[PDB]
Amino acid sequence: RDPCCYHPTCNMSNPQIC
């Protein structure tokens, strides 16, 4: 998966992935 989507805040900061 995208690295950030395993790390909430990261993907909150990148809705796009997750």
Helix-then-strand count for the chain, H and E: 1, 0
Identify the experimental approach.
Answer: NMR
Longest dimension (CA), the chain: 16
Which pair of structure tokens corresponds to residue 11? 């993907």
Residues 6+ apart with CB under 8 A from 8: none
Alpha-carbon radius of gyration of the chain: 6
